[PDB]
């Protein structure tokens, strides 16, 4: 195992005060640190810790050249769409996972952080789009959606709509309509020296 003593910045990812919107999801390149995923797996706060292509108890042995941590906020009902091969407004227009995904999808309820009593409209999602997103593609354009024959010309009219809709997050919403913070760890393995490694001493 390579001689690295740094600790991977998982605190700044899972504890950031503000998360990104699902249409503008935030990708973080994690490298040159020792990552210890066992405390992540053994934490009871996470409602979802699905792992694809790896095992959570085995992750402390493999070494990856890069780890990507994509973080965003969705509803409770849309966490089922952050699995490979899924369909829906989130899996088609906001955040797409490839069917060849290798990594962990971590989600937890953030109703105490992202819900405001009067309504938290700071989180948005793309309601309208013409084609499905390619895997790991981000579409942050805010041009008016056509949806009709007449050109939009940048004006929201009858058939011309603003693509982004806003989540209405309130603490009194149901568990399926409450905010959930999702962190998707993608484990990249290229032909480069390994940087992100398990905490094994040798």
């Amino acid at each position, epitope marked *: 195992f390579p001689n690295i003593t740094n600790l991977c910045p998982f605190g700044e990812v899972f504890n950031a005060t503000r998360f990104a919107s699902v249409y503008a999801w935030n990708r973080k390149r994690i490298s040159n640190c020792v990552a210890d995923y066992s405390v992540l797996y053994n934490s009871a706060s996470f409602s979802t810790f699905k792992c694809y292509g790896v095992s959570p108890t085995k992750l402390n042995d493999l070494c990856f050249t890069n780890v990507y941590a994509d973080s965003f906020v969705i509803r409770g*009902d849309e966490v089922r769409q952050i699995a490979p091969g899924q369909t829906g407004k989130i899996a088609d227009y906001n955040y797409k996972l490839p069917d060849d995904f290798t990594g962990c999808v971590i989600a937890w309820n953030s109703n105490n952080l992202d819900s405001k009593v009067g309504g938290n409209y700071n989180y948005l999602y793309r309601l309208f789009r*013409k084609s499905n997103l390619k895997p790991f593609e981000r579409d942050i354009s805010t041009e008016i*959606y056509q949806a009709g024959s007449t050109p939009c010309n940048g004006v929201e009219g009858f058939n011309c*709509y603003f693509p982004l809709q806003s989540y*209405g997050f309130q603490p009194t919403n149901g568990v399926g*309509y409450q905010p959930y913070r999702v962190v998707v760890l993608s484990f990249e393995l290229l032909h480069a020296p390994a940087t992100v490694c398990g905490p094994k001493k040798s």
Partner: antibody
Amino acid sequence: EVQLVESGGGLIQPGGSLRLSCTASEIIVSRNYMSWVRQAPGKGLEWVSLIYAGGSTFYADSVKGRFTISRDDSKNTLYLQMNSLRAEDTAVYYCARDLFEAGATDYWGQGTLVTVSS
Amino acid sequence: EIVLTQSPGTLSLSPGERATLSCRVSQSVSSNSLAWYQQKPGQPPRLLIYGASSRATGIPDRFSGSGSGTDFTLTINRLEPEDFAVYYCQQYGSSPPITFGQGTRLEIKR
């Protein structure tokens, strides 16, 4: 002149097949959430199927596996291939445009009656 | 699975009065995910208000929706003789993608 015109409905036998069509004017079907909603004679509205602009298709539990919603982008037509029809499938089928949080189902077709009996 | 229940099966009241229809969602949903439709007999449904408060284009100021959480209402302030039809509340966005209420019928009282 925004409009939705259904066609193809009519008499069919139980266990048969029937395909509905919905020609759109001033609405591009390939760029919209287009759904099918049926109303049993004397009963309430029931959602049947829904197709996304990207191409994702969703079906009701009662029609899953038998129905198939598609479209022809060149002809600007929305389809519903109804297979293995039962006596409970008799209803007036509406093709509708869905906007969800941006305006809900603003536009409906006139509806087409599908009668399934021997 | 979202289930919508409309409390009054039939709301009988004379023209000129105020009609208050109600929808009860099984679980607390966001207010922007509920719409109201009017179906006169032998006609396609007509959207009245979406997002639980936002009137559709061409709908007169008479129709007004409100409510949040698990309780939504539609108010027809001055019932005209053409306002007597069947009203459905619809929920959209969750699974199933579209849900409909059983419908509330308005009939003229005498």
